[PDB]
Structure formats: C-alpha cells, structure tokens
Enzyme design. Structure first.
Site, short mmCIF file in Angstrom:
data_model
loop_
_atom_site.label_atom_id
_atom_site.label_comp_id
_atom_site.label_asym_id
_atom_site.label_seq_id
_atom_site.Cartn_x
_atom_site.Cartn_y
_atom_site.Cartn_z
N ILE A 18 47.56 57.22 13.30
CA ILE A 18 46.79 55.99 13.67
C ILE A 18 47.41 54.84 12.91
O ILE A 18 47.75 55.01 11.74
CB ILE A 18 45.28 56.20 13.46
CG1 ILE A 18 44.48 54.97 13.91
CG2 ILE A 18 44.94 56.60 12.02
CD1 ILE A 18 43.04 55.27 14.09
N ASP A 49 39.59 46.09 14.19
CA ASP A 49 40.52 47.23 14.01
C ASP A 49 39.95 48.15 12.90
O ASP A 49 40.06 49.37 13.01
CB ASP A 49 41.93 46.77 13.67
CG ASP A 49 42.83 47.92 13.27
OD1 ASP A 49 43.14 48.79 14.15
OD2 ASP A 49 43.17 47.97 12.05
N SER A 85 52.93 62.41 -2.68
CA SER A 85 53.59 61.81 -3.86
C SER A 85 54.53 62.83 -4.52
O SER A 85 54.23 64.04 -4.47
CB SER A 85 52.57 61.29 -4.83
OG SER A 85 53.22 60.62 -5.90
N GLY A 139 51.71 54.72 5.16
CA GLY A 139 53.10 54.35 4.99
C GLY A 139 54.00 54.39 6.22
O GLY A 139 54.02 55.40 6.94
N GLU A 159 47.96 20.45 38.39
CA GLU A 159 47.21 20.55 39.66
C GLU A 159 45.71 20.37 39.38
O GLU A 159 45.06 19.52 40.01
CB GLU A 159 47.48 21.85 40.38
CG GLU A 159 46.72 21.91 41.70
CD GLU A 159 46.63 23.27 42.31
OE1 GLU A 159 46.51 24.28 41.57
OE2 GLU A 159 46.78 23.31 43.52
N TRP A 210 52.18 21.91 46.22
CA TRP A 210 51.70 21.30 47.50
C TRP A 210 52.82 20.68 48.36
O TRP A 210 52.48 20.02 49.35
CB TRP A 210 50.66 20.26 47.16
CG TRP A 210 49.35 20.82 46.77
CD1 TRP A 210 48.95 21.12 45.50
CD2 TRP A 210 48.23 21.12 47.62
NE1 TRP A 210 47.68 21.62 45.50
CE2 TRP A 210 47.21 21.62 46.78
CE3 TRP A 210 47.99 21.02 48.99
CZ2 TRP A 210 45.95 21.97 47.27
CZ3 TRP A 210 46.74 21.36 49.47
CH2 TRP A 210 45.75 21.89 48.62
N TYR A 250 40.67 19.22 47.87
CA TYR A 250 39.89 19.48 46.64
C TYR A 250 39.43 18.24 45.90
O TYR A 250 38.20 18.07 45.78
CB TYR A 250 40.70 20.37 45.69
CG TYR A 250 40.86 21.75 46.23
CD1 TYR A 250 39.82 22.65 46.22
CD2 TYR A 250 42.08 22.18 46.75
CE1 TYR A 250 40.00 23.96 46.67
CE2 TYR A 250 42.28 23.47 47.19
CZ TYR A 250 41.22 24.36 47.15
OH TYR A 250 41.42 25.64 47.59
N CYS A 293 41.16 27.32 50.06
CA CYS A 293 40.96 28.76 49.79
C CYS A 293 39.80 28.97 48.80
O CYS A 293 39.06 29.97 48.95
CB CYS A 293 42.27 29.38 49.28
SG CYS A 293 43.44 29.48 50.66
N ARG A 340 37.89 32.48 49.87
CA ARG A 340 37.83 32.97 51.27
C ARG A 340 39.11 33.76 51.62
O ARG A 340 39.03 34.68 52.43
CB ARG A 340 37.61 31.79 52.22
CG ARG A 340 38.77 30.82 52.33
CD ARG A 340 38.68 30.04 53.64
NE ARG A 340 39.82 29.15 53.63
CZ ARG A 340 41.05 29.47 54.05
NH1 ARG A 340 41.29 30.64 54.62
NH2 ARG A 340 42.03 28.63 53.90
N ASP A 370 45.84 35.67 48.47
CA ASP A 370 47.20 36.23 48.48
C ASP A 370 47.34 36.99 47.17
O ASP A 370 47.55 36.34 46.16
CB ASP A 370 48.20 35.11 48.67
CG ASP A 370 49.65 35.51 48.48
OD1 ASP A 370 49.90 36.69 48.15
OD2 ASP A 370 50.52 34.60 48.66
N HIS A 421 44.41 40.06 50.63
CA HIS A 421 45.55 40.62 51.40
C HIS A 421 46.80 40.69 50.55
O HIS A 421 47.01 39.84 49.67
CB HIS A 421 45.81 39.82 52.70
CG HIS A 421 45.83 38.36 52.50
ND1 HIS A 421 44.72 37.59 52.72
CD2 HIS A 421 46.83 37.51 52.16
CE1 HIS A 421 45.02 36.33 52.48
NE2 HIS A 421 46.29 36.26 52.13
#
Ligand SMILES: NC(=O)C1=CN([C@@H]2O[C@H](COP(=O)(O)OP(=O)(O)OC[C@H]3O[C@@H](n4cnc5c(N)ncnc54)[C@H](OP(=O)(O)O)[C@@H]3O)[C@@H](O)[C@H]2O)C=CC1
Ligand SMILES: NC(=O)C1=CN([C@@H]2O[C@H](COP(=O)(O)OP(=O)(O)OC[C@H]3O[C@@H](n4cnc5c(N)ncnc54)[C@H](OP(=O)(O)O)[C@@H]3O)[C@@H](O)[C@H]2O)C=CC1
Ligand SMILES: Nc1nc(N)c(-c2cccc(Cl)c2)c(CCCOc2cccc(OCC(=O)O)c2)n1
Ligand SMILES: Nc1nc(N)c(-c2cccc(Cl)c2)c(CCCOc2cccc(OCC(=O)O)c2)n1
Ligand SMILES: O=c1ccn([C@H]2C[C@H](O)[C@@H](COP(=O)(O)O)O2)c(=O)[nH]1
Ligand SMILES: O=c1ccn([C@H]2C[C@H](O)[C@@H](COP(=O)(O)O)O2)c(=O)[nH]1
Lengths: 520, 533
Positions: A11, A44, A105, A143, A297, A319, A345, A405, A425, A428, A466
């Site tokens: 580990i 962790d 050791s 180690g 954008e 675009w 938009y 979209c 809607r 891609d 799709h």
C-alpha cells in the site's frame, strides 16, 4: 507462490514530482528528506487505516488451511516497515494500532525498541515469521528500499496505490511498475482532500436460483477483444466511467440510424450523468481537451452576443461552420450576414422574446433577461422550483443558424450549495459531450460564486445520445484507457457579478491526461 | 419441505365473479386464483408463462447438490450423474397434457393417483398411492428440487399438510371462466419475497411472484472502496418492514416507490412556496415499457377521466378553465380563482382565464395572448402539428420537441408549467418520449403525470402509425410534502399488482379526433385508495 499463500500486499501513496507526456509513472513521489512530500492528506490516511486494519473473521479459516497445507501442518493484519519509514512515524502513532508491527533493520535490534514490534534483518525472516503468526493479511507500508526489494522478489500479490494529483519536492520514488507483471484491476471515485484531488487504484500481479428464474427472458458488430482493458476492470468507480459506460452501451446496444448529417449513428434515448463539482472538475482524462475555446464561448453567451466574428477574432472556430454563406443559405437565411448566427443562446439568455434584427443591434432592456432573473432567484428565493434558463425559443428556432442542443439549465439550492441539471436534446458522444460537460461545470461554478454558494452536482440529462459511425474506432481506443484523477478548476474569487468574468479568471490545475485523439 | 426442497409452481387468472361486484371491486392476492376449466387451462396459450415454467422446473445446479444430498441422508440417517428435478402431477393434471409433451422432458415425472400402477407406465415415470409415498420416493432418488405442478386437489392437500417451502406464482392479469381454483394462501403461513417485471404475452399482462414459508480477493476490495460511505431524516427501519423484506423488486412500479424511499431516507429538509415543508432531491429518471404494460400505479387507486379530459383540452389549445369545471374536472380550479390570480398580479384576468398555458403554447407559441375567448386560429407556432409532421416525415430528427416553457409568457400564466418539454424518438416503427418535469409532487402529482404522458405517447404513436416503446420521465426538483409522509409509508409496504393495459379506439387517426369514449383501461387491479394528506 509465497505472495498468494501469505497474502502479501503493498500500500502506497504517490504524488507527481518536480522536473508534457503522462503515464502511470507520472505518480511516483513517495518522500522528501525522510518524511512525506505533502503536509497531510487526511482522506488517504483514512483509507490507509481502513485497508491495513480491516479483517474478515469468517474468511480466516480458509487462509489458515492454505498456509498450513503449504507448510505441512482479535484477528489482526501484519504491517511491515523499513527502519527509515518507522523512524518517520510520530511516537504517538507507533506501533500502528490494531496491527502486528514488523520492522526491517540491520543497524537496529530488538533491544533498540521499547515498543511491541518484531524486528527482522532479512526478507526470508518475514516469511518464516508469517508462518508462525495468526494474521489476516500482510501489508508492506514502504520505504522505497522496502517496495523495491519486495517487487523485485515478486512477493506482492496486489498494490493498493493512491494517486495524489499534485506536485511536490521528492527525493524517494516508488519503483516503476512493469505492465507485464502488474495490471490495474480497479479504480475508485475521485475525491478532494486538503486542496488536492486523489483516487485509489488496485494493481494485480498478472435465493441465487430465484435470480436465474427472474432472468429466464434474457446487436452491433463489436468484437470482445475490442474492449479487453475496459472489460478486464472489476470496479470502475471513477466518474469518467459515467461517460465511457454510455459510449459502451450505445456501441453494444445502440440503434443504427441515418441522421441530418449523412454519416449515420448508433443512438439510444435517455441517460443521466452526475458529477460532484465539490470533489473534482470533470475534464475527461482518456483524451486531451483544451478549455480556452469553450470558456470564450460561455463568456460570449453571457454577454448576449450572436456575432461569430467575435469568436473567430479570438481564434475560436466552434461556430465558424454554422455562420458560412453556404450554411446560412441551406437554412434559408438568405438575408443574414456571414457569421450572424441569429437569436441563439446568448440572445435567448439575455433577451428572450425580443425581435432579432442583426448581430450589431443594441438589445438593451428588450426581451427577458433570464440570466439576471435566475441569479436573483438563487439569491432571493433559493427553494424556488422555477429557477430555469431556457434556450429553446420555439418562435425563433428557424431564425437560428441552428436550434440549441442544450435546451435548459435548472438550478437547485440546499445548505449553501448549488446544483445544476442541463437537458441536452442531441448529444454527439464522441466530440460534443466532453466539451458540454466542461462548459456547464464551469457555468455552475460561475453561478455558485456570484450567488455566494459552493458548487455541488452538475447533472447532465441526454435525450438523443449518439455515436457517429466515423468515431467508432477512435472511441474503441479511448474506452481501453484508464482514467487519471481529475483536475480542479479555480476562479478568481474577486469576481462578484456573472458579467465580470474574463478568460484570465479561470485556471485548470493538475490536468493529467492521455494523448489527444482525432475522433474522425 | 426444507429437506426435500418441495415447491409449488402455478399460474392463476382472475375468475368471472358471479355477475356480482359489491360497489367497486376490492382486490387482494386471492383475486388471482383461476387454475382450470373443464380439465384444461382457463386460457388459450400464454407462451411466456410456458417458457418460465419449462425454465424453473428444468433448471438444476449440479455444484449445489452436495448440500441437498448431504442434508437428505443426514436427516434420514444413511448412478447416471445428469441431475434432474422431480415434477408431481394429479391424475386429472397428467391427462390434460398432450402425448408428445408426456413425459415432461429432462424431469422425473411422478403422478399421485389411487387408480394407476407402475406396470401401465415405466420406472422412468413413477406413480405414488398417497402423499407419504412421495417423501419415500424422494428419499430413494437423486434429484435437485421437487415441483408440485398441481391440480387444485394436489395443491390443496400439499399446502394443508405444510409440505411446500415456496410458491412460484404466475399472476395472469385477465378474467376467464374457471371451475377449479388455487387455495387461499394464508398470509400468516406464506409471504411474497420477490416480484418480477411486468410482461405482455398473448394479449394479457402477467407477472411472476415468489411466496416463502414464514475470487473473494475482490470482495475485500469492495469494502476498501466503501471506506468513506455515510436517522438522517426521522424515519425508522420497521416503518418499511414489508418494503425492505422483499429480495427482488423488479416490478416497474418500484421505480416510483424507490424514489419515494430515497427522498424519505436521504432527502433535504426545505421550506417552499406552499409553506408546508418537503423532503427534496434533484434529478431522477424513470422508464416505463409501454409495449408491455400501462403504468398506472397499483399500490393505490388512481382515476383517469379528469387527466384524459385535461389532455384533450390541451390538444384543443384551450385556456378556459370553465370548460373543465363544467365537466367536474377540478385539476385547475384552485389556479383560476380571483384570489390565486390576484396573488400572481393578474388583476386584469377573468376568473378561470388561466392565460397562455400548455394548450396555448402547444398550438399558438409566440401569439399574443388576449383572453380565453379570442380566435387564435393560424396564430403563432402549432408545435403539436409540427412534431406529428416530423415523426411522420423525418423520424430520425433530433428536433422533435414540444415545449410549454415560453419564457416571454411565464408571468401571464396562472402558473409556469411543471411539464417543461416532451422529446420524441422513433426507431423501427416504435415511438419513445422523454418528458422533463421541473417540479415533482411525488405523493399526489407524479402518479397522474406518469399516466398523462403515457396516454399522450400512445395517442401520438397511434396517429403516426407507430407502436409505443418507452415513456421516460425526468424529475428535476423531486419532493415529498411533509403531510404525505404517513400515507407514503403505508403505500411503500404494499406489493404492486401486474399493471393494466390501455386501449385506444383504433379508428382515431388524427390527434384532434380523440374523445373521452376513445380510451379504455383494462384489467386494472389496485390496492385501496389512500388520501395523501
Ligand atoms: N508515500 C508513501 O506511501 C510512503 C512514503 N515513505 C517515505 O519513504 C522515505 C523512507 O524510505 P527509504 O529511505 O527507502 O527507506 P525505507 O523505509 O525503505 O527503509 C530502508 C531501511 O530499512 C532496512 N531494510 C530494508 N530492507 C531490508 C532487508 N532486506 N533486510 C534488513 N533491513 C532492511 C534497512 O534499515 P537499516 O539501515 O536500519 O539496516 C534499510 O536502510 C521517507 O521519506 C518516508 O516518508 C515511506 C513509506 C510509504
Ligand atoms: N393453472 C395451473 O397452474 C394449473 C392448472 N391445472 C388444471 O387443473 C385441473 C386439474 O386439477 P383438479 O381437477 O384438482 O385435478 P388434479 O390434477 O388435482 O387431480 C386430482 C387427482 O389426483 C389424485 N390424488 C390427489 N390426491 C391424492 C392423494 N392424496 N392420494 C392419491 N391420489 C391423489 C387423485 O386421482 P385418482 O383419480 O387417480 O385417484 C385425484 O382425484 C385441469 O383443468 C388442469 O388443466 C392443473 C395444474 C396447474
Ligand atoms: N496509501 C498510503 N500508503 C502508505 N504506505 C502510507 C504511508 C506513508 C508513510 C509511512 C507509513 Cl507507515 C504509511 C500512506 C500515508 C498515510 C500514512 O498514514 C498513517 C501512517 C502511520 C500511522 C498513522 O496513524 C495515525 C492514523 O491512523 O490516523 C497513519 N498512505
Ligand atoms: N407457472 C405454471 N405452473 C403450472 N403448474 C402450469 C401448469 C398448468 C397445467 C398443467 C401443468 Cl403440467 C402445468 C403452468 C402452465 C404452463 C404449462 O406448462 C406445461 C404444461 C404441459 C406441458 C408442457 O410442456 C410443453 C412445454 O414445454 O411448453 C408445459 N404454468
Ligand atoms: O453543444 C453541442 C452542439 C451540438 N452537438 C451535436 C449533437 C448533434 O450531433 C449535432 C446537432 O445536430 P442536430 O441534432 O441539431 O441535428 O451536434 C453536441 O453534442 N453539443
Ligand atoms: O402536473 C403537475 C402540476 C403540479 N405539480 C406539483 C409540483 C409542485 O409540488 C407544485 C407546483 O408548484 P411550483 O413547483 O411551481 O412551486 O405542483 C406536479 O407534480 N404535477
């Protein structure tokens, strides 16, 4: 094998090292000047304590038999440390509680220790000791010298490996893992702890009848071996798998269909992805993505602009194809100037219901400033179920270079945290969706900051989802890549208004990624 | 029965209830009890139950036989190798079965009879004289499990003599003339532990339920990946006794019930517009297979006349609340009052003039709203016509959307729409529909909302010559009203029944031509009505 009989595991936690191509060896920093390279990563420490302390009573007798057979004959784990490692641990944490402690050791002997620990001066003596003890599992805690010799000797069954997604000064390194000896089998969720992202990966040395009854009633030219690495993983909990699993589902189960474009697709209808923006920024790691364009954008949307030339003059071409003479004439927009994208938009966000004229007009105080209204609802009426931003203006669709979209964004506020649902809607998966996740994730951060909230979830709902036929070979490659821990997004905290952001107010930090792919 | 693993497997239909139903028929498990008519099955052929039967009674797990054989010898204090199940039949049962299907293949055929003996049959085909002669025969046999295939007589005596460990019970959701019945299962003796998906076979819905007598390297890795995991809300365990006692909950009604459970267990406490308090969460999806059933909730009683009238009223593009009130459909009554409109700042709106809501946006999106009596003919965008034309003429379009959320008109509506949009998907002659709902009252509204959009999906499919496939329901702000919590606790501890079917008049071929008489719900079997407050 000795590692299988005695259940010997390593580990470790590795960071990135001060010295760009990325690989598993990117995460290799173990220590600096005899201590850890980082101050404290509490999550962790929590994982380390749970893994090295967990035992299963009911499973022990099977292990006792295995070890007895090989040798000819509360439950605790054994933990093994290098002497240098042992000397790094604070007195108050030593010996490690609820574990059998073993120190390697030569220079020190049992008389040199006050503590309840076993001293061994030889690896071979560990194996003799394990033979004499009652224990569950044996964890090698390090180690660098210790990891190096136990891997060299093939005494490690599995490596529990924390990827600490930040860079620090290191002088000791985890050994480079040989992909032919060890392969990743599992990948956890991504988390944030102490201002870094991290994840946890596992390398491996290379009533039930009723279920079958209820299954009595159980497409595409995809080959098994095409997804060998993808399907070899036991636990795929990294949130990038929400994306990759949808790609897999469409390739295996998708419906073959023509589309508007002529390429033809595989398609399915109705998916949801959820990204925890409190824990990570979900920029895909299984290929390279750049965000400058999609940030420009989004800033252009917020300004209410429809002038394509504004993006082309920033060398952003997202675009460019939709503003050409040919494209606008094919849309029957004969009276539209080149790169005048119409009431898309930005216009709908700032001026919904105003009469669109041209891209140069002053629309000040015309139509509905939805963006302003939702920011006011988030601030003044946060339990509102009416906090929606809608680009789908039915009256204006035929005046747009193309219909949006990204139909709507709905917001949710609880306990000082902001979540966002975006409904798409048309998705891609190969090219658009990776950028669309990044766009709406950044937007969530921007809206949360200007409303004095913390981002919570970005929820992506896919309607027509799709894969283009021309992307299938590029996605087969991508799906056999193992995600890296995600990066983080930082915003300039001095920005208090949605309209005040500029490109330099956004930093993506610790982006670790696989090589660029041309989907085509 | 736990030594010799003796199970009953049956299929029960509903029975012509003697020309007499009390006022409204009360339903329970006993509703499904029809076994036989004049020595044959009450129905023609239900090929999915035949396939389930074959699969349950023939399935064997060789690697689990050691525990069984061990237990059988150990308890009894005591060749071919191809392990098989025993199947037990009454004589009447045995003689219904066609020749080429006798003996039952891959199974050890037993026959309880007073008036047969082995020397007419074989040693392959065992006969037994009494019940006790089965436990004897089982004692001397290699077999996986023993399945009682019945006859009313066989089941009756096996159950009364406590010899059945589990019942594999097919619920056939249709009524037939029956002369023999399955016995009334005492709910203190047996309880349902699993419920299947709902299926359509041979023009009926059915489901499958189960009654019960009342590399591990990678297993530790699962525990390690769970190291960071969590009375969050004041909801007890024993509150959901029956709900949490089921092993397999595959019935699609559980997509609704599991969301209620998730919000009750994990939901955020919030105030709201209404002043009552909710538990809320954000973002869920349910999917209903309309090819296989009509998803009208069965864990309480729902009525549809009102919600069908509402949909017809949308399709006409009406905004006149009085049209509904004159039919005693009161869904929009509270949103049309003087007091409600005045609180919306609609001081210049007539009572029950709901403004440019659904109907108006579906037929006239973008037209200037005047009043509920104006002539809007050929004004604004007829979205409803446009999506029907796209489904018929351009079925792979990704732009087949019907949107009620007109940002310009929101403040003119009595209230902004909960049902933001419908998106349509066409593949292989089949129509699927996603509806996005911004605000979801899980207790009261969502059961109706599933029925509304499922009916609409059927209507659109029928007028485009398509078959309905899936209704996909996307929930945004999904909330349980604090005043529904007790009622939904009751509801979550009810076991769904197999769903009904929806029949439309097949003559209706234009979306504008449907009337209230064109809609029939068939075979609706439901638990008692619940008042949600
Ligand atoms: N991020 C992580 O997961 C981890 C980081 N660390 C860090 O690593 C550094 C310490 O590692 P490194 O310096 O390699 O030292 P190590 O902890 O590997 O200890 C090296 C010493 O252990 C003894 N030893 C090793 N092998 C044997 C053997 N086969 N037989 C007898 N004795 C043996 C020797 O002690 P002697 O000299 O007494 O003979 C040797 O000098 C620190 O910075 C610590 O913080 C440590 C563990 C994990
Ligand atoms: N829906 C479903 O799941 C099922 C439906 N069916 C239908 O049920 C009808 C058949 O059932 P029902 O009329 O009860 O007839 P059964 O098949 O139960 O036949 C009963 C006969 O079995 C023998 N038998 C029963 N108990 C004993 C006993 N204790 N000791 C010795 N012999 C015993 C006797 O036959 P003998 O005359 O030899 O003494 C008894 O008359 C048909 O219409 C069939 O199609 C059948 C199975 C399942
Ligand atoms: N995944 C992973 N692998 C590793 N091998 C090490 C590790 C690093 C240095 C030394 C040691 Cl013993 C372990 C770490 C860093 C976390 C170390 O956490 C500790 C170590 C020793 C005692 C301790 O007690 C306090 C507590 O449990 O809260 C906690 N991470
Ligand atoms: N869940 C369930 N339980 C039951 N006990 C019965 C049932 C009903 C009548 C007679 C018999 Cl053997 C069984 C049924 C009806 C399904 C009929 O199964 C049969 C019956 C006779 C022959 C046969 O073999 C042909 C084939 O494999 O399809 C299958 N369903
Ligand atoms: O932000 C965007 C914009 C477009 N698309 C994809 C979806 C379709 O492949 C295409 C849009 O074409 P239609 O669905 O409108 O036909 O572009 C996206 O994925 N994301
Ligand atoms: O068809 C409907 C109409 C209303 N509601 C519920 C959701 C909310 O509880 C309330 C609407 O109030 P707002 O969400 O707009 O505040 O009615 C539904 O579930 N379905």
């Amino acid at each position: 094998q000795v590692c299988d009989v005695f259940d010997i595991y390593a580990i470790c936690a590795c960071c990135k090292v001060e010295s760009e191509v990325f690989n598993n060896y990117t995460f290799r920093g173990l220590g600096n000047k005899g201590v850890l390279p980082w101050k404290c990563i509490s999550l962790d420490m929590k994982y380390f304590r749970a893994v090295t302390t967990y035992v299963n009573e009911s499973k022990y007798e099977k292990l006792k038999y295995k070890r007895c057979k090989y040798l000819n004959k509360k439950l605790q784990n054994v933990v093994v440390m290098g002497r240098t490692n042992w000397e790094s641990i604070p007195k108050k944490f030593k010996p490690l509680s609820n574990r059998i402690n073993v120190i390697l050791s030569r220079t020190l002997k049992k008389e040199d220790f006050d503590e309840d620990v076993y001293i061994i001066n030889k690896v071979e003596d560990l194996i003799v000791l394990l033979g004499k003890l009652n224990y569950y599992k044996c964890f090698i805690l390090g180690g660098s010298v210790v990891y190096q010799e136990f891997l060299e000797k093939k005494l490690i069954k599995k490596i529990y490996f924390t990827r600490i997604n930040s860079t620090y000064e290191c002088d000791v390194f985890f050994p480079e893992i040989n992909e032919n000896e060890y392969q990743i089998i599992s990948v956890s969720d991504v988390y944030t702890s102490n201002n870094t992202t991290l994840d946890f990966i596992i390398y491996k040395k290379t009533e039930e009848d009723d279920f079958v009854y209820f299954n009595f009633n159980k497409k595409n030219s995809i080959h098994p071996n095409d997804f060998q690495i993808y399907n070899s993983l036991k636990y795929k909990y990294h949130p990038e798998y929400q994306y990759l699993n949808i790609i897999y589902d469409i390739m295996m189960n998708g419906n073959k269909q023509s589309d508007r474009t002529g390429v033809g697709v595989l398609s399915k209808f109705g998916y949801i992805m959820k990204f925890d923006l409190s824990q990570y920024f979900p920029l895909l790691t299984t290929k390279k993505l750049f965000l400058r364009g999609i940030i420009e954008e989004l800033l252009w949307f917020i300004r209410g602009e429809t002038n394509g030339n504004t993006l082309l003059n920033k060398n952003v071409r997202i675009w460019e194809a939709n503003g050409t003479r040919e494209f606008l004439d094919n849309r029957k927009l004969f009276h539209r100037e080149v790169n005048d994208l119409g009431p898309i938009y930005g216009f709908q966000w700032r001026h919904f219901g105003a009469e669109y004229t041209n891209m140069y007009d002053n629309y000040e105080n015309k139509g509905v400033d939805q963006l302003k209204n939702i920011i006011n609802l988030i601030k003044n009426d946060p339990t509102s179920r009416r906090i929606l931003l809608c680009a789908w203006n039915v009256k204006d669709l035929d005046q747009m270079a193309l219909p949006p979209c990204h139909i709507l964004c709905q917001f949710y506020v609880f306990d000082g945290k902001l979540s966002c649902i975006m409904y798409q809607r048309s998705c891609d998966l190969g090219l658009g969706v990776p950028f669309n996740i990044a766009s709406y994730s950044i937007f969530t951060h921007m809206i949360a900051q200007v409303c004095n909230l913390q981002p919570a979830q970005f929820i992506h709902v896919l309607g027509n989802a799709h894969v283009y036929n021309n992307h299938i070979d590029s996605l087969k490659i991508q799906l056999n890549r193992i995600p890296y821990p995600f990066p983080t997004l930082k915003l300039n905290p001095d920005i208090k208004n949605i309209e005040d952001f500029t490109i330099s107010d956004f930093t993506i930090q610790n982006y670790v990624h696989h090589e660029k792919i041309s989907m085509d």
